[PDB]
């Protein structure tokens, strides 16, 4: 819509007048406001009273944009207005997944701090620990352990985060997870123990 060229023009003399005056996938102003990542635009649009939990045809919430784009203050504003911490999209994924994929600490810490579900699984019965483990995100796993997150999340195929961590061949992360009490006996559908996956 007119948000791309509005916020892209940068003419401050007509932005607040434009918003205070009144796409193909039904994305409102808040979605592009989270895509750009500006403080006064998400706090001004959310200051007027635009709905914070608008869902498109697929279900992509704006919190998946603020979490999938790497913006801390935008998550501070969406959580400031009380956005759905466990919204559902087309694939069932949560903003914690994309928060752990982008390697953003403040987004995950401030999402889980407000009372989000640490074990919120998607349509594939997976959590953010699969992404944080397979992507080598050590500090993301650590800040997930600041809230006593579960470790026995079984994927839709039967894989655990310890399997995705041992597949990356991260010796430090494997010894850390096993040292913290990771179940080394859960077998997936392929009948592969966590010790056999690690070469």
């Amino acid at each position: 819509l007119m948000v791309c060229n509005l916020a892209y023009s940068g003419k401050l003399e007509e932005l607040k007048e434009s918003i205070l005056a009144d796409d193909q996938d039904s994305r409102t102003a808040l979605h592009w406001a989270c895509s750009a990542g500006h403080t006064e635009i998400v706090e001004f649009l959310l200051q007027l009273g635009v709905p914070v939990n608008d869902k498109d045809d697929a279900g992509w919430s704006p919190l998946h944009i603020a979490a999938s784009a790497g913006r801390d203050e935008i998550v501070k504003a969406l959580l400031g207005k009380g956005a759905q911490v466990n919204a559902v999209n087309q694939n069932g994924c949560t903003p914690l997944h994309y928060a752990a994929s982008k390697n953003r600490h403040e987004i995950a810490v401030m999402l889980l701090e407000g009372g989000a579900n640490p074990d919120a699984k998607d349509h594939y019965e997976a959590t953010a620990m699969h992404r944080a483990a397979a992507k080598g995100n050590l500090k993301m796993i650590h800040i997930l352990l600041y809230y006593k997150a579960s470790t026995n999340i079984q994927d839709t195929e039967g894989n655990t985060p310890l399997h995705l961590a041992c597949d990356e061949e991260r010796v430090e992360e494997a010894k850390l997870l096993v040292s913290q009490g990771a179940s080394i006996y859960i077998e997936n559908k392929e009948e592969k123990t966590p010790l056999q996956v690690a070469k």
């Binding site: 193909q24 996938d25 999938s68 994924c93 594939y124 992404r131 990356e168």
Partner: protein, 236 residues
């Protein structure tokens, strides 16, 4: 940080350091084998390696020499090999080897034994030319059980890049090298869109993405999105 270093020092270092192998006296291995019935491939890695270097390349269809001729075979493979070692350093991609690597008892079908004599003939010529040949020969297949033990014998194919369970780094690499030429956005994410084709095994995933480009080329939407991805996955 070991796969790109082993393949790197196994592809780009032997390509322009033949005299050093003449000094040390160790033949550089160049045979890279791809396997796995679930993942077809033969396009992402073949075009990736075939496009990392801006030079000449000569690809061959799996039935490029099957003309039931006994004397034309060695002339064709000798001419292709001499223009590949003399014209410019190219990476020959031999496909569909299971149809030319089958034995037969009856001598009436001399064309099958003849084409397996062509494949084994170039398999012997590459052994006799191990001393720093100016050509790279990669190979791919999908049914290694029907193949002969001479192909998978060491000294010919010393690299076997399989595709059982690629980690997220290989997804960022093999998907970044393909999304760098397409229209990307903040919603374009093919991690679940590649995990599902692992549950339901589908071939030529890259060709399905090209079909998604054929559905997004209608000038109705500039940036390709999840609608053409999931639509191209449920339709074809």
């Amino acid at each position: 940080d070991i796969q790109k270093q082993e393949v790197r020092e196994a592809v780009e270092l032997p390509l322009t350091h033949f005299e050093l192998y003449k000094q040390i006296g160790i033949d550089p291995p160049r045979g890279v084998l791809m396997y796995g019935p679930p993942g077809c491939g033969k396009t992402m890695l073949a075009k990736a390696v075939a496009h990392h270097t801006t030079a000449a390349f000569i690809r061959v269809v799996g039935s490029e020499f099957v003309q039931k001729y006994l004397g034309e075979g060695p002339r064709m493979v000798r001419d292709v090999f001499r223009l590949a070692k003399e014209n410019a350093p190219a990476i020959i991609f031999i496909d569909e080897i299971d149809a030319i690597a089958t034995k037969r008892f009856d001598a009436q079908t001399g064309a099958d034994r003849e084409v397996q004599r062509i494949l084994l003939e170039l398999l012997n010529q590459m052994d006799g030319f191990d001393q720093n040949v100016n050509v790279k020969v990669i190979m791919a297949t999908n049914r290694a059980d029907t193949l002969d033990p001479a192909l998978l014998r060491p000294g010919r194919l010393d690299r076997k890049i399989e595709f059982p369970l690629p980690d997220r780094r290989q997804k960022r690499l093999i998907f970044s090298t393909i999304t760098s030429k397409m229209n990307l956005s903040e919603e374009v994410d093919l991690e679940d869109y590649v995990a599902r084709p692992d549950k339901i095994s589908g071939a030529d995933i890259n060709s399905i993405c090209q079909e998604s480009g054929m559905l997004a080329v209608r000038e109705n939407r500039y940036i390709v999105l999840a609608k053409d991805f999931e639509k191209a996955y449920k339709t074809v």
